């Protein structure tokens, strides 16, 4: 779409409040837990879709975003009536679902591996998934990458090299793995429609000011870009 390419930040908060918060059912209106879910859905909508049409809009953490949305519409002020930090405190200590995966880069660090579902609505994303009980964070990333791309990264994954991202109520950690051969034959062990290399500079917002279907990719482009730059300067 283009509906946000010319919106101010205020007009974006206007849309996100009518789209997610203001018109909820009576009970979903009534619980702090229910509001956080809708705020997290809105934050994901802003980071994944709206910033793509307009990277002049800043990327924001969930807590800072929620604070600006809260200060935007006084109809939500009933919820921090007695404790102002209550809604931030709930967001801050809320236990979310851990999902783990990997950003696999080629040797030149200009391409990455993305997976697409079967549906036309499904967008490209990094191989990732929810953790099993007692599964370590690294074993989950290894299992998810191998289950979706058929590639075993257990010998090249670096447990200290990852990007953390709280998004859509998920605690997402993607480990960065460079040096993958472009000859790598991908196949799905599963759900997954295709696995493909994409050029990083073709992904939305990766270029400085150059505004098509991606899920939970764009929020990682800025920290990945810094990571590649630091390694690029080092080499």
């Amino acid at each position: 779409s283009m509906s946000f390419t010319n919106a101010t930040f205020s007009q974006v908060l206007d849309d996100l409040s009518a789209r997610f918060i203001l018109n909820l059912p009576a009970e979903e209106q009534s619980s702090v837990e229910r509001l956080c879910f809708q705020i997290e859905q809105a934050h994901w909508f802003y980071e994944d879709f709206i910033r793509a049409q307009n990277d002049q809009l800043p990327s924001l953490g969930l807590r800072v975003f929620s604070a600006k949305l809260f200060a935007h519409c006084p109809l939500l002020w009933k919820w921090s009536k007695v404790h102002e930090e209550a809604f931030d405190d709930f967001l801050r200590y809320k236990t979310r679902i851990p999902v783990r995966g990997a950003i696999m880069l080629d040797m030149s660090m200009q391409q990455c591996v993305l997976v697409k579902g079967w549906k036309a609505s499904s967008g490209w994303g990094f191989p990732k998934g929810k953790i099993d009980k007692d599964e370590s964070d690294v074993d989950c990333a290894i299992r998810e990458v191998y289950e979706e791309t058929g590639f075993d990264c257990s010998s090249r994954i670096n447990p200290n090299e990852f990007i953390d991202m709280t998004i859509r109520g998920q605690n997402v950690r993607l480990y960065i793995i460079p040096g993958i051969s472009l000859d790598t034959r991908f196949e799905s062990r599963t759900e997954i429609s295709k696995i493909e290399w994409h050029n990083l500079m073709d992904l939305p917002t990766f270029k400085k000011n150059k505004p098509n279907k991606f899920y939970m990719v764009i929020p990682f482009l800025a920290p990945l870009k810094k990571w590649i730059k630091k390694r690029n300067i080092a080499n």
């Binding site: 206007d14 849309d15 009518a18």
Partner: peptide, 14 residues
């Protein structure tokens, strides 16, 4: 009245 005002401003924006 304020909820409708914000709603209608958003709809007219699209």
């Amino acid at each position: 009245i304020l909820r409708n005002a914000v709603n209608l401003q958003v709809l007219k924006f699209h």
